[PDB]
Amino acid sequence: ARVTVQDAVEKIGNRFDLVLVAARRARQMQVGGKDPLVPEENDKTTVIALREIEEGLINNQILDVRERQEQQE
Amino acid sequence: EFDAIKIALASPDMIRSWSFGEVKKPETINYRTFKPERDGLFCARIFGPVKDYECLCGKYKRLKHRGVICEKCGVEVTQTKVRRERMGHIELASPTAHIWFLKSLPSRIGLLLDMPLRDIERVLYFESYVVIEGGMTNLERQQILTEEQYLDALEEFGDEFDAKMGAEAIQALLKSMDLEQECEQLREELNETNSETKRKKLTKRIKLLEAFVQSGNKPEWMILTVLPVLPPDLRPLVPLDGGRFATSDLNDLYRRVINRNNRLKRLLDLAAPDIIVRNEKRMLQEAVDALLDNGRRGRAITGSNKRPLKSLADMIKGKQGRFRQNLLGKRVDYSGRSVITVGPYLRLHQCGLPKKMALELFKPFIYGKLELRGLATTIKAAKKMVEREEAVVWDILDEVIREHPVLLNRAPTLHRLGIQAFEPVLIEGKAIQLHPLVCAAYNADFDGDQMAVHVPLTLEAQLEARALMMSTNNILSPANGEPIIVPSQDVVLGLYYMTRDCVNAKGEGMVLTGPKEAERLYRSGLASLHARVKVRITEYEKDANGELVAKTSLKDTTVGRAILWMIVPKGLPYSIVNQALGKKAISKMLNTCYRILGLKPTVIFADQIMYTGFAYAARSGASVGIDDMVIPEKKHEIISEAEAEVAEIQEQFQSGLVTAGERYNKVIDIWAAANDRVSKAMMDNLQTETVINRDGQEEKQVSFNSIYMMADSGARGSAAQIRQLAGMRGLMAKPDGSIIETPITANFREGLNVLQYFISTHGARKGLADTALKTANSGYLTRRLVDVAQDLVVTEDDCGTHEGIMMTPVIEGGDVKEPLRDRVLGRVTAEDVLKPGTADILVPRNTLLHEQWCDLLEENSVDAVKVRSVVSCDTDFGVCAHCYGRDLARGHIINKGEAIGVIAAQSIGEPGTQLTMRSSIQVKNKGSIKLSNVKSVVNSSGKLVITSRNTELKLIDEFGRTKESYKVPYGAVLAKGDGEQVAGGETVANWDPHTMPVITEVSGFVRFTDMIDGQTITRQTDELTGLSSLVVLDSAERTAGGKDLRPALKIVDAQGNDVLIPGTDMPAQYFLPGKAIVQLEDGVQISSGDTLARIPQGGLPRVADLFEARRPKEPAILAEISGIVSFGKETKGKRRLVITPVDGSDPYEEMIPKWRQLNVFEGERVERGDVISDGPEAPHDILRLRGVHAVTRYIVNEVQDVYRLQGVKINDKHIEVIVRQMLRKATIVNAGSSDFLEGEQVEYSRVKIANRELEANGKVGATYSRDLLGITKASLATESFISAASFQETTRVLTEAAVAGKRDELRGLKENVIVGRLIPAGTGYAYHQDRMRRR
Amino acid sequence: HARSTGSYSLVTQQPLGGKAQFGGQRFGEMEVWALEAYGAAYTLQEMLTVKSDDVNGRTKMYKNIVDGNHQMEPGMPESFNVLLKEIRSLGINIELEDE
DNA sequence: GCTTTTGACCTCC
RNA sequence: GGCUUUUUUG
DNA sequence: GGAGGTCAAAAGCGCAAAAAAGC
Ligand SMILES: [Mg+2]
Ligand SMILES: [Zn+2]
Ligand SMILES: [Zn+2]
């Protein structure tokens, strides 16, 4: 579980962009496929995405390059 | 989906296009059957079907007949929702005038046709004739006639002139009036006429004419021809129990108007005599008037309830109208209510929730999860198993609510902390459990206050709540940097009782290995909770490069402090937990953690503090008893002495040697002194006690009495209440304000006889009444602040301007009210901070200030700094990111897209509840003496007399900072020279307060020149004084031949020459005013500026009046232009004054009453914006003369003065934002190359943006002047007519927008809230950037 | 008491009020200001359009939740359309514009 | 009833 | 399901 | 003759709740 997002909002510029990117990542996680990169501990889709933000491995740039590579079929 | 909203007048053509039929039957339904009446107000043919996909005839049914008209009923087969859209029209038999356009505050028809409003109503109501075309007669085209005049003119002229009646005549004359010809005639007229009264009216008329010219509307459309009908479903005939039906006011008025139309159209067919048709048409006009607006013209239509019926205008305006009740705020689903109850075992980021509420709220979520696990297949089956409360239901509910945050609010939601997110945890019972620490933020106590819960649905909402509105992310208030998680009450008492040594206790004087061992002793009962010992402790410091270093030693502390030391994290030093640890200390300690350890450690530490405090307060068992109220022993006898005192003073009144006021003040002072003595004695007796030490001697320690512990720690109460318990209650007041001479000598511990209790209730009733009636006024004020400031969002990083305002510590002449530190903290420097050493850069330009830069200023002792401010930022439709400064919530620079206007409005409006409606100079501290804005002379006695109005005192410290500032009248006495190292507690200035002097200019000899005796001056040797002196006669005896004779006391030397002052040599005669007595005589020596004559002479409403920029009842007039004072042709009822510039012309004139005080004479040089009379200073003049940067400093100072008087801390950043929203409009001065009229009033930002490219090209700019508007009026005058319409005066704003054909852009916050789209703020700001990029 | 989805008022299509009528609470105007003070825009947009009166869209919200998918459709509040017609019921012409 | 504000009529210079 | 009237709590 | 003075009319005056009645 997670209680605060101070470190995550430190990793990204401001809180609003963090909310937007976390929402997009959670939507990808939940609607279909996209196995999360960090092991789960029986948590909801929203928080598990947010953790990936504070690991420094998901952001606006990293998330965008992946999807265009998926859509090029 | 839609770019913008367009509003304009209607046309009979578009009204006919809207409608699908015409209505002719006033009846609605059969009332026998439940079927709609054909051709009535619910006609199935006109509007639509009743049952979905079922025509009235019933011949065609189901989807197969969709889009097909039935043969006999003729009702298309489609869904029933169309009943909400299709409209009807009624063909009026005669034209009818629209009420709104006729009866606004300015009448549209009145100014368009250029007639007084009274005549138009007479014409419409058929009580007076009117000409429609004069022709070749002796009658004007727009002349008003009556019966007798026209009947005489009927046979005098006949068909030569044309005159008619009613709305038909009004429409005929309106259509006959040309528009461009009128516009060009006005254009010719304005440049010719020279009269201010004509200017404004003519400008308004020409502006309205141009508005009709540019807009695609025509004036004749203003008179209704076909009346639209509201769709049926919006005015429903809902059935109740029984055959009766519920009818709305709309149906009744529509039925009345349609029935009257039918009657008049039937009566007109038979050509009834004109007497009949006049009354019928007039009263039909009354019916339509009542339909569109009830009660505007006169007596209102009333029903069986005897109260006025609702109308269309009544259903839009007001709190019960459409806007404020169903668009800005609307009831929601997924919500619940409950009663609050404290829970100590919860962590900071979570709250309780009853099982039933959780189940009811998350029922939609449970259905899905049951389907996923396969426990039930159909939704009906899942609903069946939910209501049974099966064992699986609770398990699945627990699984689905692990991290689903919920919202908590408590009405009223004063500040933005009123709504907070939480993570629910399931509990039993039927009450909502809440964490104690946050109870201070809600201002919620556990005396029956109720909470409401709402539940977010989408992932965006959940993440938004978790990252923004969670409790752990709200620890610094937006109003000011002070923390908002301060522990209070029970916890504070526990911590205080923990850390307090006793001179002797069990197990005192031993040595302990560590805190872990110390806890073992206390639990075993082998040592007292507080007894001084020596313990080994280990503390860590982050003094290295972000790394912790360990150190170990022995400290002399108590057992309890060692127990408390476990929960403190690594970074903090040990000295922070070694004092008594009251309320004020503990919060400070907590705050230090947030300064060093970030956020997670500080929230964990706060939670641990609350746990430990509750536990050790419970184990303490601190209780209050009757014996705890220690009544001082001396108290009794002291009262006797006081009695003896008054026993003498009353005798003085019996002897007549003292008056009523003298005795009153004497007894008041004596009783106050007795009260102070009793209070001091009581505190001194209570606060200390004796207990035997280790060697058997008495030793005084701080007392362990329960009341003293609960008072000193600050947990609850203050010294005033402890006074109220033991010592006397004190002086009490009458309702009006007078103080009762006899005080209440008794305290609450002992009895109060009857009358003492009675007189004690005078104050309490006043307090309750003020508290009850302050919440109505204050909250409303907050609303007015929000609508003014709801358009402010940060949009750009840097504006790129150097303009700013200087910031100085505010001083009244005593101690600094606010030092330089806090006012400038968290802003940006407009210019580089320069060292007192010349040409040294202490602070680079465009650098944020924080703790690391502020302390640099303190060490360097800088005087003042000019910082960038929001009121001067240049970006249009927004605020520069740097200009706003540092965001107070997070502590770093503000980020784009945050709503600052609403935050400032909430911050300033929240503390309003804590407000209530109802001769010599002495230095105090050591320092130098320094004078600026001063010019004076050295008198004969050797001292200095001042002749400069702007003289201000300073007390320079050891380094150069200013400590105090005073205002002194001219012609005072300066015992010391400037620049001398003066000592404190020594008077410096002296003057006469009750008289104003006529002091001379320089050293010279007075010669009796140009005084006329007997009409201007007389030798009034009054017998009460026996002194002969020259006394100027009054203004009554003197007349035009005597008032024009001004006594000119010319100051001359021995040779009789004029004043040889440096630079100029004007003859310095002094025109003496009336009632002036000249004690000095001719030939008497005059010092340097010696006297010649001595002439004789708050709360929330204040804040509200200050913000509205109300003109004060006694406006202190100012100067207008720089130049020398020059009198004029006076005594023309008022006075005349002229200012003569050095080179410029001097045509300015203004009226001044004689009876008001005058402070400036001929022999003074006045700068623009200098006071002439006395009193309050109106904001409009301050803006007009001294500029923008003066008015913004005045308002901020006054508001902050009120707040600091009431002890409320609010940052000055929020105050000035509203000021920026008051200076929105501006008035053109000269058009130049622009395309604006001189008399127009347009937006300052609009002028700046339009003019900016004009100056960029080969053109010249347009001169303008910024104007100030009250918040109430400034809110009304905005471009976005939706927001203005929603706020106040709905009728005026809609009509003004419709007449001008204005168009909305939908760029604000409120107007975006109305139509359901994302607001351009916060998270939604990124979306609008994407949207704006596409267009 | 608490409400998930119950009755609806006939005119403005907002949920009823009062415990006896099994209605939801009132997201007051002051609450709208306070929720505006945060950066929280999506939650306010929810409160305005989906949970209150978007009769075409709020049904799709219920079906999405049961399916496990948490997503909305903005739509446009139904209470605003009423006022439009009402202003058109006078002599004032008010209309939207192109996309 | 409070209070403000704005418009309109009288009238004093 | 709208209005009116009070009463009560915060 | 008009710019100033004085009198008359419109518009607003917390928010949540609950409870009842009555229309
Ligand atoms: Mg309470
Ligand atoms: Zn039919
Ligand atoms: Zn700026």
Curated annotation (Swiss-Prot), chain A:
Question: Could you tell me the superkingdom of the organism this chain comes from?
Answer: Bacteria
Q: Which GO terms describe its molecular function?
A: bacterial-type RNA polymerase core enzyme binding; DNA binding; DNA-directed RNA polymerase activity
Which EC number(s) does the record attach to this protein? 2.7.7.6
Instruction: List the GO cellular component terms.
Output: cytosol; cytosolic DNA-directed RNA polymerase complex; RNA polymerase complex; transcription elongation factor complex
Give, as one word, the top-level EC class.
transferase
> Is Ion transport among this UniProt entry's keywords?
no
Q: Which GO terms describe its biological process?
A: bacterial-type flagellum assembly; bacterial-type flagellum-dependent cell motility; cell motility; cellular response to cell envelope stress; DNA-templated transcription initiation; intracellular iron ion homeostasis; nitrate assimilation; protein-containing complex assembly
Q: Keywords of this protein's UniProt record, alphabetized?
A: DNA-directed RNA polymerase, Nucleotidyltransferase, Transcription, Transferase
Is Secreted included in the keywords of this UniProt record? Answer: no
The reaction(s) catalysed by this protein are: RNA(n) + a ribonucleoside 5'-triphosphate = RNA(n+1) + diphosphate
* Primary role: Promotes RNA polymerase (RNAP) assembly. Latches the N- and C-terminal regions of the beta' subunit thereby facilitating its interaction with the beta and alpha subunits.
Summary of subunit composition and partner proteins = The RNAP catalytic core consists of 2 alpha, 1 beta, 1 beta' and 1 omega subunit. When a sigma factor is associated with the core the holoenzyme is formed, which can initiate transcription. The rRNA transcription and antitermination complex (rrnTAC) consists of RNAP, NusA, NusB, NusE (rpsJ), NusG, SubB, ribosomal protein S4, DNA and precursor rRNA; S4 is more flexible than other subunits.
Similarity remark: Belongs to the RNA polymerase subunit omega family.
- What is the protein name stated in its UniProt record? DNA-directed RNA polymerase subunit omega
Origin organism of this chain? Escherichia coli (strain K12)
Please spell out the taxonomic lineage of the organism that makes this protein.
Bacteria, Pseudomonadati, Pseudomonadota, Gammaproteobacteria, Enterobacterales
Gene this chain is encoded by: rpoZ
Q: What fragment of the whole protein does this chain represent?
A: 2 to 74 of 91
Swiss-Prot record, chain B:
Which residues are recorded as binding Zn(2+) 1? C55, C57, C70, C73
One GO molecular function term?
Answer: magnesium ion binding
Please list the residues that carry the modification N6-acetyllysine. K943
A GO BP annotation: DNA-templated transcription
Its cofactor is:
Mg(2+); Zn(2+)
The residues the record assigns to binding Mg(2+) are D445, D447, D449
Q: Which UniProt keywords apply?
A: Acetylation, DNA-directed RNA polymerase, Magnesium, Metal-binding, Nucleotidyltransferase, Transcription, Transferase, Zinc
Gene Ontology terms: cellular component: DNA-directed RNA polymerase complex
What pairs make up the disulfide bonds? none
Under Enzyme Commission nomenclature, its number is 2.7.7.6
By its UniProt entry, which InterPro entries does this protein fall under?
Answer: DNA-dir_RpoC_beta_prime, DNA-dir_RpoC_beta_prime_bact, RNA_pol_asu, RNA_pol_N, RNA_pol_Rpb1_1, RNA_pol_Rpb1_3, RNA_pol_Rpb1_3_sf, RNA_pol_Rpb1_4
Highest taxon of the lineage = Bacteria
Q: How is the cofactor bound?
A: Binds 1 Mg(2+) ion per subunit.
Q: Which CDD domains match?
A: RNAP_beta'_C, RNAP_beta'_N
Residues noted as binding Zn(2+) 2 in the record, renumbered to the chain: C799, C873, C880, C883
Which reactions are catalysed by this chain? Answer: RNA(n) + a ribonucleoside 5'-triphosphate = RNA(n+1) + diphosphate
Q: Which family does it belong to?
A: Belongs to the RNA polymerase beta' chain family.
Free-text function comment from the UniProt entry: DNA-dependent RNA polymerase catalyzes the transcription of DNA into RNA using the four ribonucleoside triphosphates as substrates.
NCBIfam families recorded for this chain?
A: rpoC_TIGR
Instruction: Tell me the subunit arrangement.
Output: The RNAP catalytic core consists of 2 alpha, 1 beta, 1 beta' and 1 omega subunit. When a sigma factor is associated with the core the holoenzyme is formed, which can initiate transcription.
Under which name does UniProt file this protein?
A: DNA-directed RNA polymerase subunit beta'
Gene name of the encoded protein: rpoC
UniProtKB/Swiss-Prot annotation, chain C:
Report quaternary structure and partners.
The RNAP catalytic core consists of 2 alpha, 1 beta, 1 beta' and 1 omega subunit. When a sigma factor is associated with the core the holoenzyme is formed, which can initiate transcription. The rRNA transcription and antitermination complex (rrnTAC) consists of RNAP, NusA, NusB, NusE (rpsJ), NusG, SubB, ribosomal protein S4, DNA and precursor rRNA; S4 is more flexible than other subunits. In pull-down experiments interacts with CedA.
Q: Which family does it belong to?
A: Belongs to the RNA polymerase beta chain family.
User: What is the protein name stated in its UniProt record?
Assistant: DNA-directed RNA polymerase subunit beta
Function (record text): DNA-dependent RNA polymerase (RNAP) catalyzes the transcription of DNA into RNA using the four ribonucleoside triphosphates as substrates.
Q: Which gene encodes it?
A: rpoB
What is known about its processing and modification? Acetylated on several lysine residues in the presence of glucose.
| Highest rank taxon of the organism | Bacteria
Q: Which residues of the full protein are shown?
A: 1244 to 1342 of 1342
What industrial or biotechnological use does the UniProt record describe for it?
Co-administration of salinamide and rifampicin or salinamide and myxopyronin suppresses the emergence of resistance to both antibiotics.
The taxonomic lineage of its organism, from the top, reads: Bacteria, Pseudomonadati, Pseudomonadota, Gammaproteobacteria, Enterobacterales
